[PDB]
Amino acid sequence: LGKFSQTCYNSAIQGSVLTSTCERTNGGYNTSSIDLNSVIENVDGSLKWQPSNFIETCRNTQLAGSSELAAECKTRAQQFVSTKINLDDHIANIDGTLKYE
Ligand SMILES: OC[C@H]1O[C@H](O[C@H]2[C@@H](O)[C@H](O)[C@@H](CO)O[C@@H]2O)[C@@H](O)[C@@H](O)[C@@H]1O
Ligand SMILES: OC[C@H]1O[C@H](O[C@H]2[C@@H](O)[C@H](O)[C@@H](CO)O[C@@H]2O)[C@@H](O)[C@@H](O)[C@@H]1O
């Protein structure tokens, strides 16, 4: 499941939008973007795979490593702590286009 990083490169993240160049099944490269906001939630300090507008309570979203997304999110105590999530869990590349599965 996911692992889009095996056939995609030059991945970048700005705010909640993931943008990356992926290879097509029939050869050739395709570029696309998808809003992860509809699939990431903030649970008492940690980002989880569920819709809830996480960026509304999180800031400094940035790309970490090859497939990890690092950000800071508010805990119930109203404090920003370091949080991270593996994009490889559900973000896959189907025909050069990214699709959550
Ligand atoms: O690296 C192997 C690749 O294999 C599987 O995907 C296949 C196909 O469904 C894809 O459309 C094309 C790329 O466009 O590649 C394969 O033929 C998946 O397991 C994929 O995650 C993996 O990277
Ligand atoms: O916009 C709704 C908000 O709800 C959930 O977070 C709750 C709580 O855990 C937070 O500490 C405070 C703000 O600090 O807000 C809510 O009561 C999460 O799903 C969050 O992502 C979402 O933005």
Q: Which tokens is 8 given?
A: 């995609």
Q: Measure 74 CA to ligand 1 centroid, in angstroms.
A: 37
In CATH, the architecture of 1-101 is: Roll (2.30)
Q: Which amino acid is located at 71 in the chain?
A: A
Q: Quick one: which of 46, 45, 43 has its CA closest to 75?
A: 45
**How far away, in angstroms, is 57 Cα from ligand 2 center?**
6
Nearest to 69 by CA among 17, 7, 6: 17
Tokens of 67: 């497939």
Q: Are strands 29-35 and 40-43 parallel, antiparallel or unpaired?
A: unpaired
Cβ of residue 19 lying under 6 Å from some atom of ligand 2? no
In the block, which residue shows the tokens 């973007």?
Answer: 33
* Cα atoms in the 13 Å half-sphere on the side-chain side of 18: 30
Contacts for 27 with CB less than 8 Å, ≥ 6 apart: none
Q: How far apart are CA 59 and CA 50, in angstroms?
A: 18
Degrees, nearest 5: CA angle 24-63-91: 40
Domain ranges of the chain: 1-101
